[PDB]
């Protein structure tokens, strides 16, 4: 009766969550003033690539920006002056994820080759050369984040995540338990935990140190493509193909908020938060992005002006600007 | 002015990088891409009559294609291979191949990319038609036991699944001994697709 025991345990978790729930964000934050109309204009246009953009990542200094395109190019941009600092060619053009090291010395790329390539930017020869090629995943790499100058956490399409020591090359720990392909991951501000979303319409909280799953959230009804942490570190947001965003809380272990509209029927490609967490920027399959009031679940604004689908979206560390890359092969910075 | 010496040098470096990117893009645009359907992704390169064809094979990736098929939008054509001998073997696989063809033809992304159909295992199909009648694969088949007639019926059944008759065409051929004929046919189909796309870009057509 192991299945019966699993059903009983699920029922008792559901009962515990229901008893834990006593109020909602709607009736708690209804007595706060709305953020009002949010009108963000484009300030910079980066038009160097020649194919659909698939990933991008900011730098810690909030000025350098790495982007990856399907034409086998990783371009580093100086946001203030619109300058190409570096243009790294890739061995495989099927790139689907990118990352910037917090120290700013390394970049990472990956895709359908099932290999995470780490390139070193600071060399005495003056060029950028590949520093490491981590292999061992049996599926395409969906996301990767630089946990440190020597540790990198990656997520693949084989329902697994891994933590790699770059120097040795082998993965120290492997996180397993997702039924479907893992689409995205998001590190916590203290780096002690992270969260992963997969195609089984569920998200999981992973402890980096112990390599175990702590909590599972199953609010969504379809595959989740985007995930992001609240700047506090006690909540996160997910975007799925059901044209709906959901804000979950780790401490309450349930879903806090739902962002959806009748006129929105397109899937969500990316999600991100503002510096203070009041605004939630979500890029949809529709050519424009949306800005939600994260505390009232009202549409604060829209970022229109893309020819094709918006693929990647990120917010700078100090909240000055928002970078958006689309399938149109243009990068737009908004302020 | 309002620019420092190092800033001007950085601008010059950015211009050089942009020039290199433009030349690489114009070199890459001169190529033709094909997707083959029948550790990662397998690539094959071959040049035929001053045109560079790059064929991508996606077999072995044990993951749902719904999350990565859109990466292959923009290919000139899709090459679909079908084994004629798979009409009786079951692991009924002929109907599974037909369903796969219907899915790839009705895919939202591939609403304009033409399909080139290859039929293999001819020299085995002709011999196999003498022992296993076509009624096993097709309960509604009303015809003789001629292998040419069975091949024609199979081709018609595969072609009639094309709901996007307009803006998408399904060129068809059967495998032969001479590789030159097959590569010439794929070159002709790719050239036709490229010419049609060029016409669509202009005002006419």
């Amino acid at each position, epitope marked *: 009766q192991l299945r019966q025991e699993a059903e009983q345990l699920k029922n008792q978790i559901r009962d515990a969550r229901k008893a834990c729930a006593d109020a909602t964000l709607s009736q708690i934050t209804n007595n706060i003033d709305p953020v009002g109309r949010i009108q963000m204009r484009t300030r910079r246009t980066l038009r160097g690539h020649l194919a659909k953009i698939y990933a991008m990542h900011w730098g810690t200094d909030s*000025r*350098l920006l790495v982007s990856a395109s399907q034409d086998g190019k990783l371009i580093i941009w*100086d946001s203030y*002056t619109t*300058n190409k*600092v*570096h243009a790294i060619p890739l061995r495989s053009s099927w790139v689907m994820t990118c990352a910037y090291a917090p120290s700013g010395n390394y970049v990472a790329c990956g895709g359908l080759d099932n290999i995470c390539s780490i390139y070193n930017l600071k060399t*005495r*020869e*003056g*060029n950028v050369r590949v520093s490491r090629e981590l292999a061992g995943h049996t599926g395409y790499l969906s996301c990767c984040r630089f946990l440190d100058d020597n540790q990198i956490v990656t997520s693949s399409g084989d329902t697994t995540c891994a933590l790699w020591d770059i120097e040795t090359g082998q993965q120290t720990t492997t996180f397993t338990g997702h039924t479907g392909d893992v689409m995205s991951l998001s590190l916590a501000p203290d780096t002690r935990l992270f969260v992963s979303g997969a195609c089984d319409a569920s998200a999981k909280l992973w402890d980096v140190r112990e390599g175990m799953c702590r909590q599972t959230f199953t609010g969504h009804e379809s595959d989740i493509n985007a995930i992001c942490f609240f700047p506090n570190g006690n909540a996160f947001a997910t975007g799925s193909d059901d044209a709906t965003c959901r804000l979950f809380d780790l401490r309450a272990d349930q879903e806090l908020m739902t962002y959806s509209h009748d006129n929105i029927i397109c899937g969500i490609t990316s999600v991100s938060f503002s510096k203070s967490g009041r605004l939630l920027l979500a890029g949809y399959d529709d050519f424009n992005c949306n800005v939600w009031d994260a505390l009232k679940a009202d549409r604060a604004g829209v970022l229109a002006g893309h020819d094709n689908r918006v693929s990647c979206l990120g917010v700078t560390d100090d909240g000055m600007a928002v970078a958006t890359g689309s399938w149109d092969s243009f990068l737009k910075i908004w302020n | 002015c*309002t620019l*420092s*010496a*190092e*800033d*001007k*040098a*950085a601008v*010059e*470096r950015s211009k*050089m990088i942009d020039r290199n990117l433009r030349e690489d893009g114009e070199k890459a645009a001169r190529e033709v891409k094909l997707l083959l359907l029948g550790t990662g992704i397998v690539e094959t390169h071959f040049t035929f009559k001053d045109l560079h064809f790059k064929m991508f094979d996606v077999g072995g990736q044990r993951s749902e294609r719904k999350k990565w098929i859109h990466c292959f939008e923009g290919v000139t054509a899709i090459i679909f291979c079908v084994a004629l001998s798979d009409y009786d073997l079951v692991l009924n696989r002929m109907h599974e191949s037909m369903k796969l063809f219907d899915s790839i033809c009705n895919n939202k992304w591939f609403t304009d990319t033409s399909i080139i159909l290859f039929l293999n295992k001819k020299d085995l199909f002709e011999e196999k038609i003498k022992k296993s009648p076509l009624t096993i694969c097709y309960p509604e088949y009303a015809g003789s036991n001629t292998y040419e007639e069975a091949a024609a019926y199979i081709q018609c059944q595969f072609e009639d699944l094309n709901k996007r008759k307009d803006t998408k065409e399904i060129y068809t051929h059967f495998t032969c001994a001479t590789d030159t004929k097959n590569v010439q046919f794929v070159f002709d189909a790719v050239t036709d697709v490229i010419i049609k796309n060029n016409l669509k870009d202009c005002g006419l057509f």
Partner: single-chain antibody
Amino acid sequence: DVQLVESGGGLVQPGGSRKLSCSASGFAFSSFGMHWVRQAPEKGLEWVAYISSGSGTIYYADTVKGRFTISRDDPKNTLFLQMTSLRSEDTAMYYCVRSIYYYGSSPFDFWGQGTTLTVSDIVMTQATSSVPVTPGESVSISCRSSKSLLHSNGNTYLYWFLQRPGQSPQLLIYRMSNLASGVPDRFSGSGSGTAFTLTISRLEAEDVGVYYCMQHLEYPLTFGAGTKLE
């Protein structure tokens, strides 16, 4: 191993011509701009000419314009300067210098060995010609500029170099605050407006030499007189 080896220097007569070569190995020569910097027998450093990547931009000093021509050759990794109508003031040791310009880069990082040739504007002032020092004591080297080196972007284009006895100059601080790679953390640089200083803490025997401060705000690059440490 990064290496710039210069050759083609010797004894000439006035009115003659000469060709100096500089072969580069161990780094991507085509991505680096190049400078020629000459030093008189007993004097300071003096900038001569500059060429950019791809030969897009070429600069000469006002005393070598119309007589000196700089050029490079990327497939063979060579950089050569052709000098015509040499005079007695052209006797000096020439240095091949590499410099890469992008955001957050360190120009003037590597210097060549030097080749000796014998023939027979923002003003930077170094306060003290000579300074006697003892090990284990902090020291400060100050120099001043005639025009403010702070640009609108917020960058102070001041560089520090160290010339050891019988050695090529080595970069210490670039843009007045940034410490070069491989340089001990005891070296520091700080300044305001027209005045600047370099602080050395826990001075050891490796700091004996001549310290030069150079401006990069405008391409007529100017070096200081040079402060010697005994």
